[PDB]
């Protein structure tokens, strides 16, 4: 490199064989990404098929006990296991693979392999962008799935009592995680979650509205009723009228884009910043640092037996969730609550 001799070494040979264009690009990140990602996805497919959640949660959570696609999950370890890494060789499994599946070790397997697979995938984006000589804005846009995954699947259970409170990899298990955050953390009320929701909704809006605008401002290049064949990707001319689009959205909405680079950076910026602020909120909830209560309104409702709002209704709904969910969701607490102390409404 740089008018220097640079005698060919084993590193440069392996780099030449790895950074080549083929069916699937391996690179150096493929030394990490392909095994970690393959093991994480295969472990989830194995756990949703054969691995039970009977000894960690007292639930049936695989296709072998009769569960469908939505209810099977790779479930978190027992809360008594805390934040143990659940090695197959460690103090708990002690080398026995079968007892390692039953102990909740497959969740730790899938979580660690998935996290390092996410690292490998971002590094893969980095090396492909460097090889093609393109900017790594795809990696920067992928930084938000990694922030969300780390904050929810590692930072949050690390802040809580153990991996048991991490989300279990499944459909209904994720729904359970969401409902638990509603009942216990009041995660809707948190402004960081609100910024995340606004980011996702605005990004879906941006996706739909950008696609529709581009395809309803297309130039002709036609002689045929199908427009997809009016595009030939080796051309130095735009396909759609940015001027027509700007005029249309200016007179419909009041404001409209006039810079494509700013438009596409905005399409990057809205969901990424939304997921980053949502991840910051989940990190706040990891410590039970919550946006649960409005003290002034709550004092006002306490001192006025006639003042209810949808906020106080949500607080009562949350308490109902907690008391009716705790006994079967947190079995380590042995909550043998009698049915007379469970809070309910009338009749029903």
């Amino acid at each position: 490199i740089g008018t220097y001799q640079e005698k060919r070494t084993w590193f440069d040979d392996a780099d030449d064989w790895l950074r080549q264009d083929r069916f699937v690009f391996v690179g150096w990140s493929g030394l990490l990404l392909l095994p970690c990602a393959y093991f994480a996805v295969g472990g989830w497919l194995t756990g949703c098929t054969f691995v039970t959640s009977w000894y960690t949660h007292g639930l049936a959570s695989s296709y072998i006990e009769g569960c469908n696609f939505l209810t099977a999950a790779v479930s978190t370890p027992a809360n008594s296991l805390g934040h143990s890494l659940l090695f197959v060789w460690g103090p708990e499994a002690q080398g026995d693979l079968t007892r390692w599946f039953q102990l909740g070790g497959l969740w730790a397997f899938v979580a660690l392999h998935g996290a390092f697979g996410l690292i490998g995938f971002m590094l893969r984006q980095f090396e492909i962008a460097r090889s093609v000589n393109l900017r790594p804005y795809n990696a920067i846009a992928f930084s938000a799935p990694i922030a969300v995954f780390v904050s929810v699947f590692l930072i949050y259970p690390l802040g809580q009592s153990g991996w048991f409170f991490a989300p279990s990899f499944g459909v209904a298990s994720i729904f359970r995680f969401i409902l638990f955050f509603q009942g216990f953390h009041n995660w809707t009320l948190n402004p960081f979650h609100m910024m995340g929701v606004a980011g996702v909704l605005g990004a879906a809006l941006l996706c739909a509205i950008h696609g529709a605008t581009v395809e309803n401002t297309l130039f002709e290049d036609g002689d045929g009723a199908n427009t997809f064949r009016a595009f030939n990707p080796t051309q130095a001319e735009e396909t759609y009228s940015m001027v027509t689009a700007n005029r249309f959205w200016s007179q419909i909405f009041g404001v409209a884009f006039s810079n494509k680079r700013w438009l596409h950076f905005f399409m990057l910026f809205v969901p990424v910043t939304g997921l980053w602020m949502s991840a910051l909120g989940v990190v706040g909830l990891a410590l039970n640092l919550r946006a649960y209560d409005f003290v002034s309104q709550e004092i006002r409702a306490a001192e006025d037996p006639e003042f209810e709002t949808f906020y106080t209704k949500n607080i009562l709904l949350n308490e109902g969730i907690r008391a009716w969910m705790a006994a079967q969701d947190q079995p380590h607490e042995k909550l043998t609550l009698p049915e007379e102390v469970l809070p309910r409404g009338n009749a029903l």
């Binding site: 049936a60 072998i64 006990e65 009769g66 569960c67 469908n68």
Partner: protein
């Protein structure tokens, strides 16, 4: 080398796939996890 049609291959594969999901939706009502 291009003897069997790709469309015939794909149609057979799609039949096998729809048969698999149909067996899956059939056995949601019998056997394990059927609630009877």
């Amino acid at each position: 080398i291009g003897r069997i049609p790709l469309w015939l291959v794909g149609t057979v594969v799609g039949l096998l796939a729809i048969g698999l999901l149909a067996i899956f939706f059939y056995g949601s009502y019998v056997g394990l996890g059927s609630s009877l």
